RNA sequence: UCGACCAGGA
DNA sequence: CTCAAGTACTTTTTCCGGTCATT
């Protein structure tokens, strides 16, 4: 590490200090005077030139020989140089800041446009932050053309009071190229703002006023945006690339310097020498350019500044533009060593927590160990063992610090060890190692194993340790880690560690449970059918490694001593392990051998398969991990392996194609079924086209008709297929792998069996890529079955060549959506990540960024650690009123409602104790009050819910381990379970602080698990239902509190990342296998996108008038937005001279019964008008469905156009429906076309702006009843095509507190920041459900939060959460990197280097979980322990 | 607080902060017809003291930046004529906790 | 066999069963730097220089190429070739690393411009291991 | 496609845009 | 059993690989975006079969939206900016009665829909009323005559780039025409980019022929240099040799140097694991 | 011993 | 002197042999 002793103090950097170079300051940096284009080559003679790379700088050559600074290569980093430049140039990165800057002083005295006197200028100038003050000051000086001498005075406007001197006009500042130019003023002055201009103009900006803008007195003044003094950078940056001796080949950017330079001396000769004024414009631009191109390249400006070659040219900034680029390719992911990778294989003889290193791997890769009398004689053997033999030896690191190959070394048969020494050695076996697979989505995606030195040359891996990689062995490589640190060991051991990685957080479920091989095996070991003689049973309990000696009783004694399945498959079953199930008809005697009981590690009924020993949430492996330990059941894994895996060696098992053959007579009957299906859609086909049809809503009739075909032939495919299944033997192997949930589901059987299906391309069934047919072997106008693709055929009875060519385009379908949104789902995680990094719990439990401000004050709202978390139900939400009672309720003051002294002891001396009564009322009251309260929390009445402490497994043991005998009386007291679960509470902590906030958040954290702790130990349920002694109480009060204080978070817990791979990990899986939902609308949720694809209001009826179908058909049509272009069929110009009488014979009628009636003051308002009339006929039905009447219609024209239009109108019985129009008061044939432009897409009939096709709903509701258990209560509830929640809210006889929009942008703008949260969670939830999959509530709770707790809707892109106040070196870490930097300096930042980002670019132990505290030595101990 | 029908003038609305230490609030009455806190989604927000918040910040450790905030414009802090950093502590239910508070400095 | 993987009958891998055959044809030609300063194929040794490869330069013949019998292995030279300046700088083309092999067929011919070209093909026989795909 | 070229398309190219101030004739492939 | 079909070069077993391309002269109409302020636009991929290979793409546009008042149909022609109304392109190739101009695009006079839909059209077109106030209308005497060889030259320079020819490009554009509105009135069906039919393939020939013309010419423009400095043989083989070589040895197609602009993997080392690799 | 294209793997 | 539209800019999953030119 930068190698050799150094007497310098070693210290760690904590602060990043960004500001821009002086000139001044890069001449004093400098250790060469760089004058010379030439590199090196002190003509011919292979030594550099004293005039550029060295002419002092690093070195060349390996030649300790650098400037007398000696070291040379690795030891000495780069030495800086300089090179004066003939004029001032920008900087390409601050040509924008220093034109914003010259739009903000004064372009003559330097002073600010705007002073303390303008009223905006003095709230500006207030901000707080460096970025935004800038902002304000800009937007109001750019306005600012004249540097002001006066300014009217804060008292009257009247007296003017003078500032800043000088008149003069502002230019116009406008970017031509890498050049400023202004424009002063009939005609204005157009010149360009010189380099040297702009200098002098901000040499003069003041202190006071440049620190008003972005800028920093000492780090960042505004003059240094602009290059003068430029500095080389050494060969270490821009190495000369030699290919032998005589080939020199020198790098991009030495050439770009070398260019810098060439066009500097021609500038400087021009100036120095004979001027010829309007030559020196030409080679000055050419050094802006040049000087701008070698740190920017990509420049807008189209000359790319291309090598001779054809080649661009690296720029300074395209070296750090990431992925590639130094931040994200070089920093934040490195190449490293101690690094292996080969093919992968599955061995089932390994256990869950071994990798299999091939003996060629455990040869290359080292663990260096310090030679310590412990070790110092194995350590020998190795050494003399030599780099050949396994177990044996690479180097000896002496303690002088130098390597001894024992590969060549004449003294490496010697070697007298010396402690202190290191000694690298080969890997053995159980050494920690970090594996991993990529693309590694995960935190179980890179795990640490125990080492297993084997033959052959792949990496072997247990079988159940599969799923957390999502690793296959048909090719798939995996990379492994060694440790070097005997700390870093501990790191993987302790918190790496397979058996650890057992329970996920991210579902709060065990990650890893029994597959293939040995969960098919596992149930065909299980069912009642399966029986074990002698010979066998003795070779099974062998397997075992932890088997206890004894041979169990057989189960069968009788003739044949035969042992279960079940029975010997229990010995793998440790002790204490309780499990109970009830699947379907499970009745404690199963008799379908359904459900699953495991009492004391035995199986007592039911079959073993997925729902047991799979990675299912109740199942055996979340029970052992939490009961036993993490290494109790990395062993249950093996065991079961063990035995399941030689069970099924010696029965077998196969696939034939008998397993997809159907029975005749079924065959038929599915054929038949495929028949009566087809007939049913040409019935609707040809009725269809009868034109009978009747389409439902928000479709055409077409739309409509198709989703009745597909329906048709949907229906047809799933019962065809079941007939198949229902036909198939239990002896079809094929069913038997969907029964042990081995491999395989229904459809697979239905489409291999049976028939395949419909096909589809975008949705909809393949379609006329052709004129009106699929393929040229159709006819056109062909709806048919077997024209849009539907496979009548299974995969057994084969493919017609239309039915391939249709299901080729479906499957060529998946391929692509595999493809396309692999990357955007992937590019949903980075950023999820770079949003979330920083983010972890700290010690005082609060939730907090790099920047230690609040996100969550405790985490996940509970301070819960997602892996100790299993749903549970609360008992007191659901049922009747009655039933709780029952259930609950203790009167000690009535005869019938007592305890009976069959109970408790106490039981005939406590009845009309009106003390215990007191304390049981209490207790009874309390249960009332939650079930109010978890009522009003789950609104919905759903009792089951994920929380720490499995009490119904506490209670299970407590039973199986003080033998509880269900008939005698308990020694427990009211008093006793009354005061006991009241204290058990008090002790349920979370939160320590002393104080009254923290007592008070303590309470709060609590008050849910504590519903479920009441619920569960009431004085009735304690006593009649589990029948506690009293020391079985104490015992389960113990273990409550033992449990739930190691369900606690930890501080240091990377709470940010899990949370960001939890909802990652999913969505990349939910696209990688093969209303806008899914990626495209969690893409529009992160993003915050604007204009969402499918804005939608759900609107909910008032409370007496949910059910009344009525109320809601009035809103519909209230709320539904029609314009009378809806209702119009055409609109006609007529040319009608005189308006008393209409030319139009149809019209007659019309004029009659307007003119007469209606001759209040319209004859003189007029007595014409226009001769010109505009008449438009209108739909009977349009009117009708859009509920209107010619009336209604008129009088909004009337009163759109009020009385600069006539309208008149026939009436509704009339055949034909006309409203006539004509102006009030030269060209009014064109002014009257614009009219009907307003009438028809401008004006509102009926409804609400921007409300489309509403829908009624009959919604079901879970309400509760008055007797009080919940019941199915339907309503009605509309659904929009459009969103304005600010007017439909307002709308009278809907439910304005029950009103939703999936646009939660609107929610948060109508409802507050707050019920945004709620509406944004709400969302990010359903695209995450939407995909069946569980996500644990905290990690989506997070990222809600992150967006929300800024104020506002914080986009998680460049534009949203890397524009926060967090430290430069972490923000450039994605997205903007370059640009992040430069502004860094501009506003000299200074990082906290706080963030993991910063730590990891400094190589630096981040604050992150093991490093978030610190390590001490205390004395006082050191002298107590000896 | 005044409460207008359609507009005020720009002229007129220009008057607002003309009478220090006293304060004005203007609210349309279409945004005043549907009481916002009601309904589902909206918590209950919390004026905080200059001495409850004072204690929050000492309690927590926080400097008034590390809180998260509630925007001068919103919805609710309209509501309860929040100023520029009074603190809001909202209750809310949780699925997890049964009930957590947060709290909300001002914009 | 579990989870996409083969059990195979090593008995049948030994009577032939799936057996491939791997040939590499390694290139080199002697480089021409103008004014006649040409590069040679020869087996070289110390000399002033002293620029050289690890692997054994023993199995060339005094043409620095291998004969077509020889079993080469590891980072064992196969061509020997030379580069002089203004000297043993090397030139020589040792066998891939990884690889291991019997030299099969080697061709001396001239490029179009009159240099000496070399290519050398080494042929070996790949036997079904464990982490073979099929 | 290539003996298209050769027989056809070969003679088009050095006949259409060709003569200059010298003009091209018959095109021969050995 | 080798088949051939592919190149030695440099004694390596180089593929040329067919490119898929859009076929040319094909007149496509196509539907605009929903914040656009043209509905629909007709194109027309016009090149010459063999003659430089004409890059020039001709767009007809239909301005305004359904539901916008008076819709103008202008059209693009290249090296002129603007987008000239198609009464002033009519007039300027010669049909200058609106009426002929209307005969040229509907070829039915019973069909008032179309016809109500160029009235606008014929409005905006009306303030130049003759072929050389026309002409003068592509920007005198200077602009009269540029005009005159651009519709020469560049407009349609399929069909003919002779000269009288006018008559068959008027009947053409009105061809165009009559397909946009044809699919404005939603009569016929909007084009299908991506049927199969109307896409080609550039084998091993076209690809060659495409790099010869190219590499010739370069060697035509060597030649010219030669005669100038020639004040009183010369034909560089390598232009053509090296040219042709170094296409089909990198892939990345070009070839003039080359650079990063064209290119590709155009020519490949042939596979040879397996006989049908 | 430098990096660009092409072709591939899970 | 407001606000519609045109203008430009910046992103796009993770790891893992041959051939060309030129350094
Ligand atoms: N382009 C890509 N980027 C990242 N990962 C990929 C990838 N292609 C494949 N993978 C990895 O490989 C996994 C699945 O691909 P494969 O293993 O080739 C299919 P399979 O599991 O063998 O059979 P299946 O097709 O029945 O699922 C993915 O979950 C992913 O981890
Ligand atoms: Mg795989
Ligand atoms: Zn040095
Ligand atoms: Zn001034």
């Known amino acids: 590490v930068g190698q050799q002793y150094s007497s310098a103090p070693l210290r760690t950097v904590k602060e990043v200090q960004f500001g821009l170079f002086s000139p001044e300051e890069v001449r004093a940096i400098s250790v060469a005077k760089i004058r010379f284009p030439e590199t090196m080559d002190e003509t011919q003679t292979r030594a550099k030139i004293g005039g550029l790379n060295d002419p002092r700088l690093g070195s060349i050559d390996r030649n300790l020989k650098c400037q007398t600074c000696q070291e040379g290569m690795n030891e000495c980093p780069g030495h800086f140089g300089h090179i004066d430049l003939a004029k001032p140039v920008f900087h390409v990165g601050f040509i924008a800041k220093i034109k914003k800057v010259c739009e903000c002083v004064c372009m003559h005295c330097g002073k600010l446009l705007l002073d303390e006197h303008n009223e905006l200028m003095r709230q500006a100038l207030a901000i707080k932050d460096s970025k935004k003050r800038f902002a304000a000051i800009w937007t109001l000086c750019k306005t600012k053309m004249v540097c002001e001498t006066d300014v009217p005075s804060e008292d009257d406007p009247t007296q003017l009071v003078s500032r800043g001197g000088c008149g003069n006009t502002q230019p116009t500042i406008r970017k031509d190229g890498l050049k400023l130019v202004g424009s002063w003023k009939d005609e204005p002055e157009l010149r360009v703002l010189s380099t040297e201009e702009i200098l002098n103009i901000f040499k003069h900006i003041s202190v006071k006023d440049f620190t008003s803008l972005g800028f920093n007195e000492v780090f960042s003044r505004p003059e240094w ?140 890769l080292t663990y260096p160990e310090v030679v310590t009398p412990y070790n110092i004689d194995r350590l020998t053997q190795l050494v003399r063992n030599g780099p050949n033999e396994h177990p044996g030896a690479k180097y000896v690191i002496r303690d002088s610090g130098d390597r001894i190959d024992l590969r060549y070394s004449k003294r490496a048969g010697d070697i007298q060890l010396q402690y202190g020494w290191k000694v690298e050695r080969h890997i053995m076996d159980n050494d920690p190692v970090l594996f991993n697979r990529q693309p ?72 890893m449970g029994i597959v293939q091989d040995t969960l098919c095996g596992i149930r065909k ?128 098992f196969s696939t034939g194609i008998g397993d997809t053959i159907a029975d005749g007579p079924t065959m038929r009957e599915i054929t038949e079924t495929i028949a009566e299906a087809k007939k049913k859609v040409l019935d609707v086909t040809k009725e269809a086209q009868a034109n009978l049809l009747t389409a439902k809503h928000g479709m055409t009739l077409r739309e409509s008709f198709e989703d009745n075909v597909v329906r048709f032939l949907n229906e047809a495919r799933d019962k065809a297929g079941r007939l198949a299944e229902v036909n198939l033997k239990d002896l079809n192997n094929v069913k038997q792998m969907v029964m042990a949930g081995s491999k395989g589901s229904f459809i697979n059987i239905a489409q291999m069996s049976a028939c395949v299906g419909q096909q589809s391309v975008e949705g909809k069934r393949i379609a006329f890529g052709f004129v009106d047919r699929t393929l040229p072997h159709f006819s056109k106008d062909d709806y048919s079955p077997e024209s849009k693709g539907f496979v009548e055929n299974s995969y057994l009875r084969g493919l017609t060549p239309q039915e391939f060519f249709f299901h080729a385009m479906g499957g060529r379908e998946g391929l692509i959506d595999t493809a396309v949104k692999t990357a955007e789902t992937g590019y949903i995680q980075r950023r999820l990540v770079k949003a979330l990094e920083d983010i972890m719990v700290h010690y005082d439990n609060t939730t907090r960024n790099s920047l230690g401000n609040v996100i969550q004050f405790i985490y996940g709202e509970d301070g819960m650690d997602a892996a100790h978390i299993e749903k549970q139900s609360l008992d007191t939400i659901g049922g009747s009123d009655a039933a709780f009672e029952k259930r609950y309720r203790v009167d000690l003051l009535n005869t019938d409602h007592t305890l009976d002294p069959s109970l408790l002891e106490s039981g005939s001396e406590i009845l009309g104790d009106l003390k215990l009564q007191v304390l049981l009322d209490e207790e009874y009251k309390q249960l009332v009050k939650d079930r109010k309260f978890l009522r009003e929390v789950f609104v919905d009445g759903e009792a089951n819910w994920p929380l720490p402490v499995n009490i119904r497994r506490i209670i299970q043991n407590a039973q199986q381990t003080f033998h509880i005998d269900h008939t005698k009386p308990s020694d427990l007291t009211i008093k006793d379970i009354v005061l006991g679960v009241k204290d058990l509470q008090e002790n349920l902590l979370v939160l320590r602080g002393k104080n009254e906030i923290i007592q008070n958040a303590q309470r709060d954290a609590v008050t849910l ?108 049509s209230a709320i539904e937005h029609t314009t009378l272009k809806s209702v119009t069929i055409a609109s006609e110009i007529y040319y009608d001279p005189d308006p008393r009488s209409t030319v139009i014979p149809e019209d007659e009628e019309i004029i009659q019964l307007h003119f007469s009636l209606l001759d209040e003051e319209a004859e003189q308002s007029f007595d014409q008008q226009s001769p010109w009339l505009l008449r438009l006929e209108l739909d009977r039905a349009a009117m009708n469905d859009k509920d209107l009447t010619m009336g209604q219609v008129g009088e909004r024209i009337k009163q759109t156009f009020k009385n600069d239009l006539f309208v008149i109108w026939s009436e509704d019985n009339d055949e034909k429906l006309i409203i006539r129009c004509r102006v009030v008061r030269a060209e009014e044939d064109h002014m009257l076309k614009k009219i009907e432009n307003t009438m028809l897409e401008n004006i509102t009939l009926r409804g609400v702006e921007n409300i489309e096709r509403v829908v009624m709903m009959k919604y079901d509701r879970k309400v509760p009843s008055p007797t009080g258990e919940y019941v199915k209560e339907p309503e009605w509830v509309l659904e929009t095509d459009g969103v304005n929640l600010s007017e439909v809210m307002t709308v009278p006889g809907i439910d304005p507190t029950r009103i939703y929009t999936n646009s939660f942008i609107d929610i948060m703008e109508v409802l507050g920041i707050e019920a945004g949260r709620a509406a944004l969670y709400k969302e990010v939830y359903n695209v995450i459900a939407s995909d069946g999959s569980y996500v644990n509530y905290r990690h989506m709770a997070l990222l809600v939060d992150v967006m929300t707790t800024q104020g506002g809707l914080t986009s998680v892109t460049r534009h949203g959460f890397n524009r926060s106040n967090t430290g430069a070196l972490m923000r450039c870490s994605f997205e903007e990197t370059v640009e992040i930097l430069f502004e860094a300096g501009a506003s000299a930042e200074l990082d906290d280097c706080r963030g993991v980002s910063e730590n990891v670019i400094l190589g630096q132990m981040a604050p992150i979980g093991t490093g978030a505290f610190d390590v001490m030595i205390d004395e006082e101990s050191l002298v107590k322990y000896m | 607080i005044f409460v207008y029908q359609n507009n005020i003038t720009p002229s007129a609305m220009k008057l607002v902060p003309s009478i220090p230490p006293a304060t004005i609030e203007t609210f349309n009455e279409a945004a005043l017809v549907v009481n916002i806190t009601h309904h589902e989604l909206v918590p209950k927000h919390i004026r905080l003291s200059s001495d409850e918040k004072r204690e929050l910040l000492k309690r927590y450790r926080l400097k008034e930046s590390q809180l998260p905030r509630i925007q001068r414009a919103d919805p609710v802090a309209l509501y309860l004529g929040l100023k520029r950093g009074e603190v809001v502590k909202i209750i809310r239910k949780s699925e997890t906790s049964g009930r957590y508070a947060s709290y909300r400095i001002c914009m | 066999n579990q989870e996409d993987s083969m059990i195979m009958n090593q008995s049948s891998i030994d009577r032939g069963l799936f057996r491939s055959l791997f040939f590499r044809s390694y290139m080199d030609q002697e480089k021409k730097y103008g004014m006649s300063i040409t590069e040679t194929f020869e087996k070289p040794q110390r000399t002033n220089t002293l620029r050289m490869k690890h692997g054994t330069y023993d199995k060339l013949d005094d043409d620095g190429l291998i004969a077509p019998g020889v079993r080469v292995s590891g980072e064992d030279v196969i061509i020997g070739k030379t580069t002089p ?50 | 496609s290539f003996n298209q070229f050769v027989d056809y398309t070969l003679q088009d190219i050095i006949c259409e845009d060709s003569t200059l101030i010298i003009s091209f004739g018959k095109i021969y492939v050995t | ?55 020039s793409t001709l767009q007809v546009k239909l301005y305004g939206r359904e539901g916008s008042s008076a819709r103008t149909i202008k059209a693009t022609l290249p090296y002129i900016k603007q987008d000239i109304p198609i009464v002033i392109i009519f007039r300027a190739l010669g049909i200058i009665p609106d009426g002929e101009i209307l005969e040229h695009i509907c070829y039915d006079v019973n069909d008032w829909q179309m016809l109500e839909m160029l009235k606008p059209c014929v409005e905006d077109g009306f303030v130049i009323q003759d072929r050389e106030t026309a002409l003068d209308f592509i920007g005198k005497e200077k602009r009269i005559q540029y005009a005159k060889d651009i519709l020469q030259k560049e407009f349609l320079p399929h069909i003919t780039q002779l000269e009288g020819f006018e008559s068959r490009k008027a009947f053409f554009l009105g061809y165009m025409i009559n397909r946009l509105l044809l699919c404005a009135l939603d009569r016929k069906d909007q084009d299908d980019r991506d049927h199969f039919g109307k896409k080609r393939l550039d084998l091993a020939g076209p690809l060659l022929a495409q790099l010869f013309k190219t590499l010739f010419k370069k060697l035509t423009k060597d030649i010219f240099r030669y005669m100038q400095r020639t004040v009183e043989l010369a034909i560089n083989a390598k232009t053509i040799t090296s040219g042709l070589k170094y296409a089909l040895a990198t892939g990345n197609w070009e070839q003039k140097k080359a650079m990063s602009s064209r290119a590709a993997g155009v020519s490949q080392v042939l596979n040879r694991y397996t006989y049908s690799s």
Not at chain 1, 441 to 459: D, E, Q
Not at chain 1, 465 to 473: E, G, R
Not at chain 5, 29 to 52: C, M, N, Q, T, W
Request: aromatic residues 6%; hydrophobic residues 40%.
């Open chain 1, 525 to 652: 070991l299980t069912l009642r059918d399966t029986f074990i003689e002698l010979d066998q049973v003795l070779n099974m309990l062998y397997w075992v490694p932890d088997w206890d000696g004894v041979i169990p009783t057989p189960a069968i004694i009788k003739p044949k001593p035969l042992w279960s399945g079940k029975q010997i498959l229990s010995v793998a079953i440790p002790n204490g392990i309780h499990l109970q199930r009830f699947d379907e008809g499970t009745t404690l005697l199963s008799p379908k051998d359904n459900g699953m009981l495991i009492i004391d590690g035995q199986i007592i009924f039911g079959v073993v398969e997925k729902k047991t020993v799979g990675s299912s949430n109740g199942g055996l492996i979340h029970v052992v991990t939490r009961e036993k330990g993490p290494q109790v059941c990395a062993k249950l894994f093996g065991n079961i392996q063990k035995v399941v895996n030689f069970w099924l060696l010696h029965n077998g």
């Open chain 5, 1 to 55: 059993f080798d088949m051939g079909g592919y190149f030695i070069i440099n004694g390596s077993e180089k593929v040329l690989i067919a490119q898929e391309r859009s076929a040319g002269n094909i007149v496509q109409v196509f539907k605009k975006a929903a914040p656009s302020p043209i509905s629909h636009v007709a194109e027309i991929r016009s090149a010459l079969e063999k003659g430089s290979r004409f890059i």
């Open chain 1, 225 to 364: 945006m602009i290059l003068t003094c430029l500095p080389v950078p050494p060969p270490p940056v821009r190495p000369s690339i030699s290919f032998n001796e005589s080939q020199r080949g020198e790098d991009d950017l030495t050439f770009k310097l070398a260019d810098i330079l060439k066009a500097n001396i021609s500038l400087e000769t021009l100036e120095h020498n004979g001027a010829p004024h309007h030559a020196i414009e030409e080679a000055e631009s050419l050094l802006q350019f040049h000087v701008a191109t070698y740190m920017d390249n990509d420049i807008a400006g189209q000359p790319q500044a291309l090598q001779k070659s054809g080649r661009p040219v690296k720029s300074i900034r395209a070296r750090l533009k990431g992925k590639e680029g130094r931040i994200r390719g070089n920093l934040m992911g490195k190449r490293v060593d101690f690094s292996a990778r080969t093919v992968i294989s599955g061995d089932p003889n390994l256990e869950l927590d071994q990798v299999g290193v091939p003996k060629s791997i455990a040869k290359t």
């Open chain 3, 85 to 134: 300046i203004s000297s043993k700088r090397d030139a020589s083309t040792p066998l891939r690393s990884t690889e291991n092999g019997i030299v099969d067929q080697v061709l001396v011919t001239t490029n179009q411009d009159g240099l000496k070209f070399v290519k050398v093909r080494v042929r070996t026989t790949k036997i079904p291991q464990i982490g073979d795909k099929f």
């Open chain 1, 440 to 511: 590694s989505l995960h935190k179980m995606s890179m795990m640490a194993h125990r080492v297993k030195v084997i033959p052959y040359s792949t990496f072997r891996l247990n079988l159940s340790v599969t799923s957390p990689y999502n690793a296959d062995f048909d090719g798939d490589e995996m990379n492994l880690h060694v440790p070097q640190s005997e700390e870093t060991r501990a790191e993987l051991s302790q918190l790496c560690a397979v058996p650890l990685q057992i329970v996920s957080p991210q579902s709060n479920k065990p990650c």
């Open chain 1, 1009 to 1116: 698990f504590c519903c479920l702790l009441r619920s569960r130990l009431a004085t009735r349920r304690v006593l009649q239902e589990y029948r506690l002694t009293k020391q079985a109480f104490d015992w389960v009060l113990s273990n409550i509190e033992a449990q739930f204080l190691r369900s606690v978070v930890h501080p240091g817990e990377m709470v940010g990342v899990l949370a960001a791979q939890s909802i990652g990990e999913p969505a990349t899986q939910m696209t990688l296998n093969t209303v806008t939902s899914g990626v495209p609308r969690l893409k529009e949720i992160l993003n915050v996108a604007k204009n969402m694809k499918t804005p939608s209001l759900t609107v909910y009826l008032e409370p007496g008038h949910a059910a009344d179908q009525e109320q809601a058909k009035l809103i519909r």
